Scaffold this active site. Structure first.
Site, PDB file in Angstrom:
ATOM      1  N   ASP A 121      -1.708 -13.377 -10.541  1.00  0.00           N
ATOM      2  CA  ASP A 121      -2.744 -13.148 -11.842  1.00  0.00           C
ATOM      3  C   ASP A 121      -4.007 -13.371 -11.403  1.00  0.00           C
ATOM      4  O   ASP A 121      -4.877 -14.472 -11.296  1.00  0.00           O
ATOM      5  CB  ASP A 121      -2.328 -14.648 -12.086  1.00  0.00           C
ATOM      6  CG  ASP A 121      -2.581 -14.625 -13.704  1.00  0.00           C
ATOM      7  OD1 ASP A 121      -2.254 -13.538 -14.870  1.00  0.00           O
ATOM      8  OD2 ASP A 121      -3.150 -15.590 -13.889  1.00  0.00           O
TER       9      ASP A 121
ATOM     10  N   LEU B 135       8.133 -13.731 -11.576  1.00  0.00           N
ATOM     11  CA  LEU B 135       6.977 -14.827 -11.065  1.00  0.00           C
ATOM     12  C   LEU B 135       5.760 -14.347 -10.191  1.00  0.00           C
ATOM     13  O   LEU B 135       6.653 -13.350  -9.086  1.00  0.00           O
ATOM     14  CB  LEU B 135       8.050 -15.933  -9.597  1.00  0.00           C
ATOM     15  CG  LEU B 135       7.791 -16.339  -8.307  1.00  0.00           C
ATOM     16  CD1 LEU B 135       7.948 -17.457  -8.271  1.00  0.00           C
ATOM     17  CD2 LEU B 135       7.914 -16.358  -7.178  1.00  0.00           C
TER      18      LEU B 135
ATOM     19  N   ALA C 110       7.784  -1.230 -18.526  1.00  0.00           N
ATOM     20  CA  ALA C 110       7.840  -1.635 -16.841  1.00  0.00           C
ATOM     21  C   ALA C 110       8.200  -2.553 -17.032  1.00  0.00           C
ATOM     22  O   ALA C 110       7.843  -3.611 -18.038  1.00  0.00           O
ATOM     23  CB  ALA C 110       6.093  -1.160 -17.122  1.00  0.00           C
TER      24      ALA C 110
ATOM     25  N   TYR D 196     -12.735 -16.008 -12.949  1.00  0.00           N
ATOM     26  CA  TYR D 196     -12.705 -17.020 -11.811  1.00  0.00           C
ATOM     27  C   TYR D 196     -13.040 -16.962 -10.364  1.00  0.00           C
ATOM     28  O   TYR D 196     -12.678 -17.885  -9.309  1.00  0.00           O
ATOM     29  CB  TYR D 196     -10.970 -16.311 -11.375  1.00  0.00           C
ATOM     30  CG  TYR D 196      -9.701 -16.590 -12.079  1.00  0.00           C
ATOM     31  CD1 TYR D 196      -9.321 -17.775 -13.368  1.00  0.00           C
ATOM     32  CD2 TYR D 196      -8.389 -16.633 -12.727  1.00  0.00           C
ATOM     33  CE1 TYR D 196      -8.907 -18.313 -14.283  1.00  0.00           C
ATOM     34  CE2 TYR D 196      -7.192 -16.569 -13.455  1.00  0.00           C
ATOM     35  CZ  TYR D 196      -8.199 -17.598 -14.152  1.00  0.00           C
ATOM     36  OH  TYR D 196      -6.581 -16.963 -15.114  1.00  0.00           O
TER      37      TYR D 196
ATOM     38  N   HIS E 124      -8.704 -12.620 -22.766  1.00  0.00           N
ATOM     39  CA  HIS E 124      -8.872 -13.972 -22.183  1.00  0.00           C
ATOM     40  C   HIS E 124      -8.413 -14.912 -23.101  1.00  0.00           C
ATOM     41  O   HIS E 124      -7.390 -15.934 -22.653  1.00  0.00           O
ATOM     42  CB  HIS E 124     -10.017 -13.960 -20.660  1.00  0.00           C
ATOM     43  CG  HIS E 124      -9.718 -15.685 -20.220  1.00  0.00           C
ATOM     44  ND1 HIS E 124     -10.717 -14.879 -18.648  1.00  0.00           N
ATOM     45  CD2 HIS E 124      -8.935 -15.843 -19.621  1.00  0.00           C
ATOM     46  CE1 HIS E 124      -9.932 -15.823 -17.753  1.00  0.00           C
ATOM     47  NE2 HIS E 124      -8.951 -16.839 -18.779  1.00  0.00           N
TER      48      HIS E 124
ATOM     49  N   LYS F 130      -7.821 -10.116 -16.843  1.00  0.00           N
ATOM     50  CA  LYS F 130      -8.262 -10.257 -18.157  1.00  0.00           C
ATOM     51  C   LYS F 130      -9.308 -10.564 -18.518  1.00  0.00           C
ATOM     52  O   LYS F 130     -10.822 -11.084 -17.516  1.00  0.00           O
ATOM     53  CB  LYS F 130      -7.301 -11.937 -18.552  1.00  0.00           C
ATOM     54  CG  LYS F 130      -6.812 -13.094 -17.182  1.00  0.00           C
ATOM     55  CD  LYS F 130      -6.852 -14.989 -17.986  1.00  0.00           C
ATOM     56  CE  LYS F 130      -4.831 -14.585 -17.059  1.00  0.00           C
ATOM     57  NZ  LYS F 130      -5.772 -14.768 -15.806  1.00  0.00           N
TER      58      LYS F 130
HETATM   59  N1  LIG Z   1      -4.788 -17.566 -19.022  1.00  0.00           N
HETATM   60  C1  LIG Z   1      -5.700 -18.661 -18.712  1.00  0.00           C
HETATM   61  O1  LIG Z   1      -6.714 -18.890 -19.911  1.00  0.00           O
HETATM   62  C2  LIG Z   1      -5.506 -19.484 -17.337  1.00  0.00           C
HETATM   63  C3  LIG Z   1      -5.781 -20.672 -18.182  1.00  0.00           C
HETATM   64  C4  LIG Z   1      -5.341 -21.257 -16.492  1.00  0.00           C
HETATM   65  C5  LIG Z   1      -4.523 -21.093 -15.856  1.00  0.00           C
HETATM   66  N2  LIG Z   1      -3.827 -19.866 -15.835  1.00  0.00           N
HETATM   67  C6  LIG Z   1      -3.438 -19.543 -14.513  1.00  0.00           C
HETATM   68  O2  LIG Z   1      -1.909 -19.823 -14.007  1.00  0.00           O
HETATM   69  C7  LIG Z   1      -2.324 -19.958 -12.738  1.00  0.00           C
HETATM   70  C8  LIG Z   1      -1.573 -21.648 -13.192  1.00  0.00           C
HETATM   71  O3  LIG Z   1      -2.393 -22.848 -12.307  1.00  0.00           O
HETATM   72  P1  LIG Z   1      -3.329 -24.102 -12.478  1.00  0.00           P
HETATM   73  O4  LIG Z   1      -4.548 -23.117 -11.657  1.00  0.00           O
HETATM   74  O5  LIG Z   1      -3.196 -23.899 -13.683  1.00  0.00           O
HETATM   75  O6  LIG Z   1      -2.278 -24.761 -11.537  1.00  0.00           O
HETATM   76  P2  LIG Z   1      -0.743 -25.355 -11.552  1.00  0.00           P
HETATM   77  O7  LIG Z   1       0.164 -23.945 -11.278  1.00  0.00           O
HETATM   78  O8  LIG Z   1      -0.587 -25.747 -12.059  1.00  0.00           O
HETATM   79  O9  LIG Z   1      -1.170 -25.788  -9.792  1.00  0.00           O
HETATM   80  C9  LIG Z   1      -1.936 -25.622  -8.857  1.00  0.00           C
HETATM   81  C10 LIG Z   1      -2.175 -26.368  -8.535  1.00  0.00           C
HETATM   82  O10 LIG Z   1      -1.270 -27.364  -7.940  1.00  0.00           O
HETATM   83  C11 LIG Z   1      -1.220 -27.144  -6.820  1.00  0.00           C
HETATM   84  N3  LIG Z   1       0.688 -26.812  -5.542  1.00  0.00           N
HETATM   85  C12 LIG Z   1       0.339 -25.145  -5.771  1.00  0.00           C
HETATM   86  N4  LIG Z   1       2.431 -25.615  -5.231  1.00  0.00           N
HETATM   87  C13 LIG Z   1       2.321 -26.603  -5.247  1.00  0.00           C
HETATM   88  C14 LIG Z   1       3.312 -27.078  -4.111  1.00  0.00           C
HETATM   89  N5  LIG Z   1       4.006 -26.854  -4.109  1.00  0.00           N
HETATM   90  N6  LIG Z   1       3.235 -28.384  -4.283  1.00  0.00           N
HETATM   91  C15 LIG Z   1       2.047 -29.610  -4.708  1.00  0.00           C
HETATM   92  N7  LIG Z   1       0.766 -28.940  -5.609  1.00  0.00           N
HETATM   93  C16 LIG Z   1       1.561 -27.385  -5.624  1.00  0.00           C
HETATM   94  C17 LIG Z   1      -1.916 -26.508  -5.907  1.00  0.00           C
HETATM   95  O11 LIG Z   1      -2.779 -26.897  -4.491  1.00  0.00           O
HETATM   96  P3  LIG Z   1      -2.943 -25.549  -3.406  1.00  0.00           P
HETATM   97  O12 LIG Z   1      -3.707 -24.068  -4.075  1.00  0.00           O
HETATM   98  O13 LIG Z   1      -3.567 -26.389  -3.150  1.00  0.00           O
HETATM   99  O14 LIG Z   1      -1.690 -25.117  -2.453  1.00  0.00           O
HETATM  100  C18 LIG Z   1      -2.656 -26.278  -6.780  1.00  0.00           C
HETATM  101  O15 LIG Z   1      -3.384 -27.846  -6.555  1.00  0.00           O
HETATM  102  C19 LIG Z   1      -3.572 -20.063 -12.473  1.00  0.00           C
HETATM  103  O16 LIG Z   1      -4.025 -19.976 -11.192  1.00  0.00           O
HETATM  104  C20 LIG Z   1      -4.221 -18.759 -13.261  1.00  0.00           C
HETATM  105  O17 LIG Z   1      -3.375 -17.884 -12.717  1.00  0.00           O
HETATM  106  C21 LIG Z   1      -4.598 -18.534 -16.836  1.00  0.00           C
END
Ligand SMILES: NC(=O)c1ccc[n+]([C@@H]2O[C@H](COP(=O)([O-])OP(=O)(O)OC[C@H]3O[C@@H](n4cnc5c(N)ncnc54)[C@H](OP(=O)(O)O)[C@@H]3O)[C@@H](O)[C@H]2O)c1
Length: 314
Positions: free
Chosen positions: A42, A14, A9, A47, A109, A76
């Site tokens: 994701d 992105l 798959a 969450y 997770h 997850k």
């Molecule tokens: N696997 C794991 O254990 C786990 C743990 C952490 C993260 N992750 C995943 O990875 C994603 C990673 O994101 P993260 O939540 O860690 O945060 P991130 O991608 O680092 O950033 C999210 C933050 O950055 C802002 N943002 C978005 N687009 C931007 C832009 N173009 N300009 C300025 N700021 C920007 C968002 O604002 P707004 O929302 O205000 O637009 C929010 O404040 C998560 O949402 C999640 O799905 C997974």
């Protein structure tokens, strides 16, 4: 654009993160993302928004915008469902909130098993996080046959150190390999030893927190920002892109899948306009040189959990 997975798959390089994405704004976030042209969401149970994130996918499916197989929905399994009996039930709850009949990738997770109960984070009276005596290989055999009930197309893991990945690899009977180990990875935690180990193993790397997780509840004294780094900001204005657009292009060209979180309709837009430009060898090795070994999410309450993934070098 889509990376081929070891299950045949293809997986959109992105996608949109939903951690920290409010229930009120994460229905309309997904719908707009999909419209903008996102085909990868994701999700996680912990969450707390998958219902509202699944109202979004049912409108685009009603609306005929996307067929289900155009999408690539990811989820997850949280740490309190690590026992063989709990695993199917947790995929099944996720599967009904999101309102889909199969997931494409189901990830473990964390490596760390907690006490099963209503709390995502069980504690004792000393205040510390309570563990399940279950292990990774047991939990893997419960996921390995979510695949066999046809509930998930693929299974993966999140935040395993190279040794942890190895455990599954030399587990006799290993019927199903890890398609994907998702991990944190930005210019300050560049992760190339795990990234260049998983890749030799046919495991795909998703880089989460690609922009610095600028809104995770922690903020320290004087934490570092990437979305505001002077060095990273120059590199952008050269490409007439934004510091986001550059910080999203960096993973992509490391052959990594990228899941930037946004609930803002014009940012969701901006984040998508990353397909039309290259970073240079200078930029990629400069960007790379910036690593500082700093993580957003270090799970500080399972430091002492037998399965804490972060004491090993990579
Ligand atoms: N696997 C794991 O254990 C786990 C743990 C952490 C993260 N992750 C995943 O990875 C994603 C990673 O994101 P993260 O939540 O860690 O945060 P991130 O991608 O680092 O950033 C999210 C933050 O950055 C802002 N943002 C978005 N687009 C931007 C832009 N173009 N300009 C300025 N700021 C920007 C968002 O604002 P707004 O929302 O205000 O637009 C929010 O404040 C998560 O949402 C999640 O799905 C997974």
């Amino acid at each position: 654009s889509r990376l081929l997975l070891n299950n045949g798959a293809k997986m959109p390089i992105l996608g949109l993160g939903t951690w920290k994405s409010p229930p009120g704004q994460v229905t309309e976030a997904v719908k707009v993302a999909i419209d903008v042209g996102y085909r990868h969401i994701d999700c996680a149970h912990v969450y707390q928004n998958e219902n509202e994130v699944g109202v979004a996918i049912q409108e685009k499916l009603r609306e005929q915008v996307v067929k289900r197989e155009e999408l690539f929905i990811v989820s997850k399994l949280w740490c309190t469902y690590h026992e063989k009996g709990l695993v199917k039930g947790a995929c099944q709850k996720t599967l009904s909130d999101l309102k889909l009949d199969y997931l494409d990738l189901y990830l473990i997770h964390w490596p760390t098993g907690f006490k099963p109960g209503k709390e995502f984070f069980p504690l004792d009276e000393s205040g510390n996080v309570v563990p399940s005596d279950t292990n990774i290989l047991d939990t893997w055999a419960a996921m390995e046959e979510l695949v066999d009930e046809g509930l998930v197309k693929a299974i993966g893991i999140s935040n395993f150190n190279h040794l942890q990945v190895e455990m599954i690899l030399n587990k006799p009977g290993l019927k199903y390999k890890p398609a994907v180990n998702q991990i944190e990875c930005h210019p300050y935690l560049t992760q190339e030893k795990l990234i260049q180990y998983c890749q030799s193993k046919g495991i795909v790397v998703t880089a989460y927190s690609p922009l610095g997780s600028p809104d995770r509840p922690y903020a320290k004294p004087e934490d570092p920002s990437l979305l505001e780094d002077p060095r990273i900001k120059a590199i952008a204005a050269k490409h007439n892109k934004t510091t986001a657009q550059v910080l999203i292009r960096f993973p992509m060209q490391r052959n990594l899948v990228v899941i930037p979180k946004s609930v803002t309709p014009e940012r969701i837009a901006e984040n998508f306009k990353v397909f039309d430009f290259e970073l240079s060898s200078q930029d990629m090795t400069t960007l790379l040189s910036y690593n500082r070994n700093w993580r957003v999410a270090a799970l500080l309450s399972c430091t002492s959990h037998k399965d804490y993934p972060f004491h090993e070098e990579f």
